[PDB]
Amino acid sequence: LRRKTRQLK
Amino acid sequence: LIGCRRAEVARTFKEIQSLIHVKTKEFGKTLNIMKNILRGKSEDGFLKIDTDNMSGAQNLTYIPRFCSHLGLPMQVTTSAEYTAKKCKEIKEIAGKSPITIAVVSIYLNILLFQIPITAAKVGQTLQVTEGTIKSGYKILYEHRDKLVDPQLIANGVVSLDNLPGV
């Protein structure tokens, strides 16, 4: 239920 | 790679596999399947004469790219082209791969024109073991007059004594 990759500004 | 070999602009295997992370097994088998099915489709459709377009070695096409990666002058490129063309006459290097014979011919012409680059740098750039280059240079050291371009020594720009001893 997780999001794996994400963007860090 | 079939498209590269179709237009006399053929590439090698290592630079293809540097881009596509694929093993040699399925790539070779897929190449054989492609060649068989394209020849079958050409026989079913418009027949085409090969006249050395999907030749296995094609070592004459790999000379100027490696010379440009080494930054050699174009006269050295033409001399290495003549050397690679004349390597078909020698029976002791006929079974060698086109890449290694191109590399050793390029190194021989570098030592002929006294281009100040090392064999270690050539091995680092062209990803060839220095032992293979040394073995090719040793086996081509006896064949002096069969590889050096006769009008190059007729013009006096190169000489046979510039090659270092083995």
Binding site: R2, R3, K4, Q7, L8 | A7, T61, P64, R65, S68
Partner: protein, 142 residues
């Protein structure tokens, strides 16, 4: 304007969005996998080369504007950037602030990002430092 764009504005544009960070969390599907990773790529300096052209067979030679005009080529120079890669790992446990540490795997690093067309007689073209008779040698009008 073209000299200002090549010499200064290219570097500013690279340094504006040089840092690019991708974050991977623990993937808590099992208790052995509790590692958070952070991959940062940073574009360092930009280098612009002299004008050149690559051929069909991969042969690259320096291109001059007369040859570029006759062969229907583009009078462009490659751009390279010094990219630095940083990989960070951390123990991902609840109730504790994440502290990322370097894995000491930093490879460096010119990589081709594109051919910028070069305005003639800029600070980058061949004709800039050419003298008079050199400029007729290249089949150009003085």
């Amino acid at each position: 304007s073209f000299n200002q764009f090549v010499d200064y504005t290219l570097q500013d544009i690279i340094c504006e969005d040089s840092t690019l960070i991708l974050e991977q969390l623990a993937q808590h599907t099992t208790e052995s996998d509790n590692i958070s990773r952070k991959y940062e790529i940073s574009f360092g300096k930009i280098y612009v080369t002299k004008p050149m052209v690559n051929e069909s067979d991969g042969v690259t030679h320096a291109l001059y504007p007369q040859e570029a005009r006759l062969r229907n080529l583009t009078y462009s120079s490659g751009l390279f950037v010094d990219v630095k890669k940083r990989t960070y790992e951390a123990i991902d446990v609840p109730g504790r602030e994440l502290k990322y540490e370097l894995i000491a795997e930093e490879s460096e690093g010119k990589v081709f990002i594109g051919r910028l067309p070069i305005m003639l007689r800029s600070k980058n073209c061949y004709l800039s430092e050419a003298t008079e008779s050199d400029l007729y040698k290249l089949k150009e009008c003085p």
